[PDB]
RNA sequence: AUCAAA
């Protein structure tokens, strides 16, 4: 299954545990007008899962970020930037 | 390793 949840949504893996949404809007907002930002975190420490997501208003403002910020760093920790895929903690059922 | 949303 090759799935990509529409242009403009990025996957931001390898982030610091100290990074949050404000740093993620502030850093990816440098490439395009953000419409949404995600930052994934532990449910007992509310830190970070070490990866996040962001939605741009243009599918190519996200390309310009995913062509600049990819392989760089956030809060001192090296990251990946790419078009986002769908989650994998859940699967189809019944039928 | 810079690997995916509870």
UniProtKB/Swiss-Prot annotation:
Q: Which residues carry this modification: Phosphoserine?
A: 88, 91
Q: In which tissues is it expressed?
A: Expressed strongly in oral keratinocytes, but only weakly detected in oral squamous cell carcinomas (at protein level).
Where exactly is the Glycyl lysine isopeptide (Lys-Gly) (interchain with G-Cter in SUMO2) cross-link placed along the chain? 22, 80, 86
Please list the residues that carry the modification N6-acetyllysine: 30
RRM domain sequence ranges: 8-86
Protein localization: Nucleus
Tell me where on the tree of life, at the top rank, the source sits: Eukaryota
Q: Which residues carry this modification: N-acetylmethionine?
A: 1
Report the function annotation for this chain: RNA-binding protein that plays several role in the regulation of pre- and post-transcriptional processes. Implicated in tissue-specific regulation of gene transcription and alternative splicing of several pre-mRNAs. Binds to and stimulates transcription from the tumor suppressor TXNIP gene promoter; may thus be involved in tumor suppression. When associated with SAFB, binds to and stimulates transcription from the SREBF1 promoter. Associates with nascent mRNAs transcribed by RNA polymerase II. Component of the supraspliceosome complex that regulates pre-mRNA alternative splice site selection.
Query: Which disorder is it connected to?
Result: Intellectual developmental disorder, X-linked, syndromic, Shashi type: A disorder characterized by significantly below average general intellectual functioning associated with impairments in adaptive behavior and manifested during the developmental period. MRXS11 patients manifest moderate intellectual disability and craniofacial dysmorphism.
The UniProt subunit note reads as follows: Homomultimer. Interacts with SAFB/SAFB1. Found in the supraspliceosome complex. Identified in the spliceosome C complex. Interacts with KHDRBS3. Forms a complex with ILF2, ILF3, YLPM1, KHDRBS1, NCOA5 and PPP1CA. Interacts with CLK2, KHDRBS2, SAFB, TRA2B and YTHDC1. Interacts with ERAP1; the interaction is RNA-independent. Interacts with PPIA/CYPA.
Domain remarks in the Swiss-Prot or TrEMBL record: The RRM domain is necessary for RNA-binding, but not for splice site selection, indicating that its splicing activity does not require direct binding to RNA.
Name of this chain's protein: RNA-binding motif protein, X chromosome
**What organism does the UniProt record list as the source?**
Homo sapiens (Human)
Location of this fragment in the whole protein: 1 to 95 of 391
């Amino acid at each position: 299954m090759v799935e990509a949840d529409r242009p403009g949504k990025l996957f931001i893996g390898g982030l610091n545990t100290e990074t949050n949404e404000k740093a993620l809007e502030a850093v990816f907002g440098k490439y395009g007008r953000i419409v949404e930002v995600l930052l994934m975190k532990d449910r007992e420490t509310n830190k970070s899962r070490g990866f996040a997501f962001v939605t741009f208003e243009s599918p190519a403002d996200a390309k310009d970020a995913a062509r600049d910020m990819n392989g760089k760093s956030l809060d001192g920790k090296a990251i990946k930037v790419e078009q986002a895929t769908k989650p994998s903690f859940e699967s189809g059922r019944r039928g």
